[PDB]
Design a protein around this ligand. Structure first.
Ligand SMILES: *[C@@H]1O[C@H](CO)[C@@H](O[C@@H]2O[C@H](CO)[C@@H](O)[C@H](O)[C@H]2NC(C)=O)[C@H](O)[C@H]1NC(C)=O
Ligand SMILES: *[C@@H]1O[C@H](CO)[C@@H](O[C@@H]2O[C@H](CO)[C@@H](O)[C@H](O)[C@H]2NC(C)=O)[C@H](O)[C@H]1NC(C)=O
Ligand SMILES: *[C@@H]1O[C@H](CO)[C@@H](O)[C@H](O)[C@H]1NC(C)=O
Ligand SMILES: *[C@H]1O[C@H](CO)[C@@H](O)[C@H](O)[C@@H]1O
Ligand SMILES: [Cl-]
Ligand SMILES: [Cl-]
Ligand SMILES: [Cl-]
Ligand SMILES: [Zn+2]
Ligand SMILES: [Zn+2]
Ligand SMILES: [Zn+2]
Ligand SMILES: [Zn+2]
Ligand SMILES: [Zn+2]
Ligand SMILES: [Zn+2]
Length: 665
């Protein structure tokens, strides 16, 4: 008999060391406790009480080792007796331990082949050779990843009766033979997973890939948490004309032929994803671009009340400019006070008639990008109020708000502007707008307490309080580019860019895997000029030659690499749904939810969900590696080969689930 709390104990020397272990647990939502061990030492928390174990797993980074000088040399800052308490806890309560960034020694059942890893720019490929100890992790065996920049130690298992190999360093320029990279130890009942390589989840995509092995193994696939990867790709500036960067003085506006190519390609890329996936492209519209196109001819202008909204744009304010409330000057023409354009006017745009066709509309996501794309950093309430309401009426008249995938309470702010203009945010709020999207290159717009949370505007910092700013990634597929030559040129001119378009896609592949394998649900920023494909020179992406747009080439690169590494689904959700999950994630993290599991004769038989007062506004996710006896009428989730996720709604009493097949320890 006995019970164990599902809290993960993370032991490290400083907050930087612990972050390479807590970031993964935080991404899953797994409750954890951080114990920092200075060189002077520290005492361990209460590991157990009577018949209840306080921790479901232990993670130790670099053996919390310091150089004590003298003949002592490098030693763990935890005493020998403290390490024995941890080993004793592992045995009595069946708790596993993970150690990464450790040197191969007798404590890990291995010895170093003798030497460091690889210097700067020296690659050594790494791959899992046996994933049978953590099958619900969904890692594809044999797929190679990069160790460049991560110091490691090629190792050799010394006694194969207590230590098995799960990862392997490939041969390279320094080494002629493969070697052991990670092991699992069984020391007379004590189970341990040891990684002979450093971790750096802040910059390394490889580290964010590896962490899913030790997290799944440490928890046996059973934990309070949730593993989902969202792939949301937003296309700004639809119906607008954008000035192209490389062939200066040229302009591009997406065409019907271009869009037919994108439509035909969506099922193609869907069939490349693992089972359970579901991808679509979400579009942000500017209604005034539809009126201006229809008014491009003399007779068309007569059909559109003379044309759309027209004004002179002011010079851009400094970034993060907070407009003093009540100031500014209106730019909108005084004559059109309300959206008053004819349906027949809008129909003169070939691109509109395509978008309004139900078969086309219902294959994409739709959200407002303001009517005229007016920058709102220094705009007035009156201007921004019409920027929102006009585009709402246009979306309603044209029928886009009837789409299967539509966002009604959120916008993509134009060029991410007005987020510090209180009068603008109030104009959003006075219409149905409650959330929006930000820019992850501007730290002011990101949550400073937890990356998994959205930022909430404040009266002090933004002139308005309550607007939810969801994060969004930027890419080297730039907003004013329509060809590979363009993006590569702007990447070269405005960055450390160097190489071809494949070189640009290669760095985008690594950076996006770091986001996706880190369970960052942020969307990605693209623009209408990036969809140009109908008339482009064919290029080759991963050996397949086609008339890919720069947007498609990015998605092809990202999706194929994701599928090469894991078998998880890729699920696209609307901006409205994405903002909802960001809010629910933030809210349930304030309830202090926890899990505990009961053990009966060396086997896990049940779990119990709890929170502060056993109540929470939001349901608590619980991941099952074995199906419980009954989901008890709660909302469940199990796409593709994912484990079963049960959203447990706590209402005052703690909920308990019985494992249909008990998990042996
Ligand atoms: C390799 O590890 C195994 C497992 O720890 C060792 O097997 C133990 O051997 C001792 C003495 O021979 C026995 O008292 C234990 O009962 C054994 N344990 C198990 C689980 O079988 C084995 O001796 C090790 N090999 C070497 C060469 O030391
Ligand atoms: C924000 O808007 C205000 C209001 O239009 C700007 O103030 C005007 O600035 C121009 C400079 O071109 C002056 O000629 C006007 O006299 C100013 N009017 C008032 C009422 O102050 C302000 O410059 C804008 N700031 C930014 C950064 O764009
Ligand atoms: C923790 O469990 C051990 C047995 O493994 C026991 O000896 C010890 O007293 C417990 N700690 C408590 C009750 O504080
Ligand atoms: C519980 O589930 C396992 C497989 O998930 C079975 O092997 C067992 O018999 C029980 O049905
Ligand atoms: Cl037609
Ligand atoms: Cl319809
Ligand atoms: Cl770069
Ligand atoms: Zn835009
Ligand atoms: Zn601008
Ligand atoms: Zn944009
Ligand atoms: Zn990025
Ligand atoms: Zn598969
Ligand atoms: Zn076991």
């Amino acid at each position: 008999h006995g019970s164990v709390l599902s809290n993960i104990l993370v032991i490290a020397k400083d907050s930087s060391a612990a972050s390479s272990a807590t970031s993964g647990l935080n991404a899953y939502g797994i409750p954890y406790t951080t114990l920092l061990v200075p060189q002077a030492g520290v005492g361990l928390p209460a590991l157990n009480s009577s018949n209840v174990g306080n921790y479901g797993g232990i993670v130790v980074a670099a053996e919390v080792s310091y150089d004590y000088g003298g003949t002592t040399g490098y030693q763990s800052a935890l005493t020998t007796d403290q390490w024995n308490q941890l080993y004793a806890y592992q045995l009595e309560y069946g708790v596993r331990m993970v150690q990464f960034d450790v040197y191969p020694g007798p404590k890990f059942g291995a010895s170093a082949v003798n030497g460091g890893c690889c210097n700067t720019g020296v690659e050594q490929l790494l791959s899992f050779t046996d994933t049978s100890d953590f099958p619900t992790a969904g890692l594809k065996t044999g797929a190679t990843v990069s160790t460049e920049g991560l110091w490691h130690y090629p190792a050799t298992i010394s006694n194969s009766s207590n230590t098995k190999e799960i990862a392997q360093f490939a041969p390279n320029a320094v080494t002629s033979t493969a070697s052991t990279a990670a092991v699992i130890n069984n020391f007379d009942g004590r189970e341990q997973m040891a990684f002979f390589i450093g971790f750096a989840t802040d910059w390394s995509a490889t580290s964010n890939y590896l962490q899913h092995a030790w997290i799944t193994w440490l928890t046996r696939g059973l934990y309070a948490g949730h593993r989902r990867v969202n792939l949301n790709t937003q296309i700004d500036d639809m119906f607008l004309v954008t000035d192209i960067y490389y062939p200066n003085g040229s302009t591009f506006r997406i065409t019907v032929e271009d869009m037919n190519g994108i439509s035909a390609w969506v099922p193609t890329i869907n069939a490349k994803m693992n089972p359970g996936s579901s991808y679509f492209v979400e579009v942000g519209h500017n209604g005034n671009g539809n009126i201006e196109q229809s008014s491009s001819t003399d007779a068309g202008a007569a059909a559109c009340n003379g044309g759309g909204i027209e004004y002179d744009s002011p010079p851009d304010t400094p970034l993060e400019f907070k407009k003093p409330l009540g100031t500014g000057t209106d730019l909108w023409p005084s004559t059109p006070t309300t959206y008053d354009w004819t349906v027949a006017c809008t129909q003169l745009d070939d691109l509109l008639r395509w978008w309004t066709t139900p078969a086309n509309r219902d294959a994409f996501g739709h959200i407002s990008h303001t009517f005229t794309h007016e920058e709102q950093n220094n705009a007035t309430y009156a201007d921004v109020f019409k920027e929102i309401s006009f585009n709402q009426a246009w979306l309603k008249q044209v029928g886009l708000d009837q789409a299967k995938w539509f966002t009604s309470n959120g916008i993509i702010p134009p060029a991410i502007t007005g987020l510090h203009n209180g009068d603008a945010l109030q104009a959003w709020w006075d219409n149905g707008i409650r959330n929006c999207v930000g820019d992850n290159t501007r730290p002011v717009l990101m949550n400073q307490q937890n990356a998994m949370w959205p930022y909430f505007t404040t009266v002090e910092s933004d002139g308005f309080a309550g607007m939810q700013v969801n994060p969004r990634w930027a890419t080297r597929i730039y907003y004013n580019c329509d060809t590979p030559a363009c993006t590569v040129q702007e990447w070269i001119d405005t960055s450390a860019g160097a190489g071809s378009f494949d070189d640009l896609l290669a760095v985008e592949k690594a950076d996006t895997m770091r986001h996706l394998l880190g369970l960052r649900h942020d969307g990605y920023m693209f623009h209408q000029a990036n969809l140009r494909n109908a008339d482009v020179t064919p290029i080759t992406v991963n050996g397949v030659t086609a008339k890919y747009s720069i947007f498609q080439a990015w998605v092809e690169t990202i999706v194929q690499e994701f599928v090469r590494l894991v078998d998880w689904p890729l699920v696209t959700i609307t901006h409205q749904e994405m903002s909802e999950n960001f809010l629910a994630r933030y809210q349930r993290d304030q309830c202090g939810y926890g899990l505990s599991y009961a053990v009966a004769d060396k086997k896990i038989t049940a779990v119990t969900v709890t929170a502060t007062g056993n109540t929470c506004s939001r349901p608590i996710p619980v991941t099952f590696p074995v199906a419980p006896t009954s989901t008890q009428g709660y909302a469940t989730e199990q796409l593709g080969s994912d484990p079963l996720t049960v959203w447990v709604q706590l209402s005052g009493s703690p909920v308990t689930f019985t494992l249909s097949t008990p998990i042996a320890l």
